């Protein structure tokens, strides 16, 4: 199988396509990706017949910025008859996957696929039972078998294939399912919350997003990001000239510092987390983030970088290489990830974990 599907934000197919061509190219896994404006996905077609499975094994999924999720697929099934919906899909997956761990029937995140989404979520149930009988799915859900994807690009038109659970998005359509909490001060709270789900493996949450940690939130007003930190039982220095929500102040966990996030110097030495959602030039925000990490003012950080109008993939990769250059220059070991989150529009979210010897 030579085709790899990447789900992306509608209208970012060109970046998603530029990135995967670039990063697969770097491993001599050559091919091309067409771009269908606003389709909400991109297909990378490898030149070599089995390079598709090589690509989704060896290139780290966490290193792609503009893909929400990916999977290898086979040939496009067209015109699935309403009266015979199961057989053709089973025929495409048999011998392709044996005893898979999970099924996900997905669409592109466009408005035109909204009805089709409802169909897919319900179709999952009877389809899963049938794929079980055929031995394509294990009788029990399993983390350590590939996820089976059936991907509908239009009614009666779908691809079938898979991805490895240790190298993909754990989430449906690459979008964690989050309800907005009415007591949170801003909708942007879901950016940090989503970021927690995307970047920190769920079984490490109690350890890395730990009850009792100090955190700093730069540009905190009115407190959407602070809220997520408070929900984790952290103590927070919220840094802004604007006021913090009273609901947050009442918890007893928030210290409001009336300052400029860009000018703020932490007096404290044991801050675990710094988060920053300040609206400003990407090169400047990146510079600030590098200061924090190089000085060991925080152990981990989540922040946002706004994208330019053109050369978005190139520009944001430049920003990241700046921060990495600053780390190398001072001999500092860190892991860096960036992802255009579902709740990110013309921006990218970044996570950096610094290490001490």
Ligand X SMILES: C[S@@+](CC[C@H](N)C(=O)[O-])C[C@H]1O[C@@H](n2cnc3c(N)ncnc32)[C@H](O)[C@@H]1O
Query: Which of ligand X, its own copies, none binds 54 (CB below 5-8 Å, type-dependent)?
Result: none
Which are the contacts of 9, defined by CB distance < 8 A and separation ≥ 6? Answer: 40, 66, 68, 109, 340, 342, 344, 345
The tokens describing 292, both together, are 């924090």
* Whether 306 is catalytic: yes
Residue 192 φ/ψ, nearest 5 degrees: -70, -45
247 near ligand X (CB under 6 A)? no
Query: Cβ 316 to ligand X, closest distance in Å?
Result: 18
Among 42, 221, 274, 323, binds ligand X (CB under 6 A): 221
Query: Which of ligand X, its own copies, none binds 174 (CB below 5-8 Å, type-dependent)?
Result: none
- Point out which residues bind its own copies (CB under 8 A): 95, 98-99, 101, 135, 138-140, 142, 144-145
Which are the contacts of 91, defined by CB distance < 8 A and separation ≥ 6? Answer: none
Query: Which of its own copies, ligand X, none binds 95 (CB below 5-8 Å, type-dependent)?
Result: its own copies
Which are the contacts of 279, defined by CB distance < 8 A and separation ≥ 6? Answer: 219, 306
Which are the contacts of 93, defined by CB distance < 8 A and separation ≥ 6? Answer: 131, 134, 136, 148, 160
Q: Which is nearer to ligand X, 172 or 235 (CB)?
A: 235
Annotated binding residue at 276? no
Count CB-CB contacts under 10 A for residue 246: 10
Query: Which of ligand X, its own copies, none binds 99 (CB below 5-8 Å, type-dependent)?
Result: its own copies
Residue 72 φ/ψ, nearest 5 degrees: -75, 140
Among 91, 181, 242, 296, binds ligand X (CB under 6 A): 242
Catalytic residue among 23, 191, 306, 311: 306
Query: Cβ 117 to ligand X, closest distance in Å?
Result: 28
219 near ligand X (CB under 6 A)? yes
């Amino acid at each position: 199988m030579n085709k790899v599907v990447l789900l992306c934000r509608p209208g970012f197919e060109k970046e998603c396509a530029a990135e995967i061509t670039d990063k697969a190219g770097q491993r001599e896994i050559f091919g091309f990706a067409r771009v269908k404006e606003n389709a909400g996905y991109v297909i990378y077609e490898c030149y070599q017949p089995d390079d598709g499975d090589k690509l989704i094994r060896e290139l780290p999924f966490s290193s792609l910025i503009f893909a929400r999720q990916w999977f290898v697929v086979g040939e496009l099934l067209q015109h699935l008859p309403p009266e015979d919906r199961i057989t053709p899909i089973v025929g495409m997956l048999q011998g392709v996957v044996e005893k898979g761990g999970e099924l996900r029937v997905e669409v592109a995140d466009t408005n035109e696929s909204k009805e089709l989404l409802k169909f897919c979520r319900k179709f999952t149930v009877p389809l899963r039972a049938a794929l079980r009988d055929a031995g394509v799915l294990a009788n029990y859900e399993t983390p350590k078998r590939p996820v089976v994807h059936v991907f509908f690009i239009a009614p009666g038109c779908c691809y079938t294939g898979y991805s490895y659970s240790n190298n993909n998005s754990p989430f449906y359509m690459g979008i964690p399912r989050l309800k907005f909490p009415a007591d949170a001060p801003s909708r942007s709270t879901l950016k940090l919350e989503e970021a927690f789900h995307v970047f920190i493996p769920a079984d490490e949450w109690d350890e890395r997003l730990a009850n009792g940690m100090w955190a700093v939130d730069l540009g905190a007003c009115p407190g959407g990001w602070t809220y997520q930190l408070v929900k984790r039982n952290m103590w927070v220095y919220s840094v802004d000239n604007g006021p913090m929500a009273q609901s947050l102040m009442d918890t007893g966990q928030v210290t409001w510092l009336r300052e400029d996030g860009f000018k703020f110097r932490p007096t404290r030495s044991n801050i675990s987390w710094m988060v920053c959602d300040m609206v400003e030039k990407p090169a400047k925000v990146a510079a600030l983030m590098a200061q924090w990490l190089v000085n060991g003012w925080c152990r981990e950080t989540i922040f946002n970088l706004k994208l330019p109008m053109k050369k978005r993939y190139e520009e944001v990769s430049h920003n990241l290489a700046y921060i990495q250059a600053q780390l190398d220059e001072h001999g500092i070991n860190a892991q860096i990830q960036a992802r255009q989150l579902y709740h990110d529009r013309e921006e990218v979210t970044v996570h950096v974990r610094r290490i001490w010897a």
